Homo-oligomer: A and B are copies of this chain.
């Protein structure tokens, strides 16, 4: 269908944004007076922390550019997780019979 397939594709897109966001956030933050967004294996963990919108506080950006990257990974999580709710909402609606 569409609903069932657009969602599955959005999760493939979310992984893209995480890896790209992690690796972009490092080069944005690394040379500044700021938190450990200075190694990749920590930026990956930050992405997941942020895209889920759990936001522990153990890591975050302090650069203007690094904070842009943030917004992107934030909405990428919210939106793509919204699709998966939407997909299930029509699967449940697709039982009106």
Residues of A within 8 A of B (CB): 1-3, 6, 41, 45, 48-50, 52-58, 60, 64, 67, 70-71, 74-75, 78-79, 81-96
A1 touches which of B45, B78, B84, B95 (Cβ 8 Å):
B95
Given contacts A55-B54, A67-B45, A95-B3, contact A85 B85 (CB under 8 A): yes
A11 to chain B minimum Cβ distance, whole angstroms, is 10
Copies of this chain, tallied across the complex? 4
The smallest beta-carbon distance between A76 and chain B, in angstroms, is: 11
In the complex, the answer to whether A74 meets B89 with C-beta atoms within 8 Å is: no
Question: Within the complex, which residue of B6, B41, B74, B92 is in contact with A86, where a contact is CB–CB below 8 Å?
Answer: B92
**Distance of A75 Cα from B45 Cα, bound (Å):** 14
Chain B residue nearest to A44 in the complex (CB): B67
Distance of A5 from chain B, by nearest CB (Å): 10
Cβ-closest chain B residue relative to A94: B96
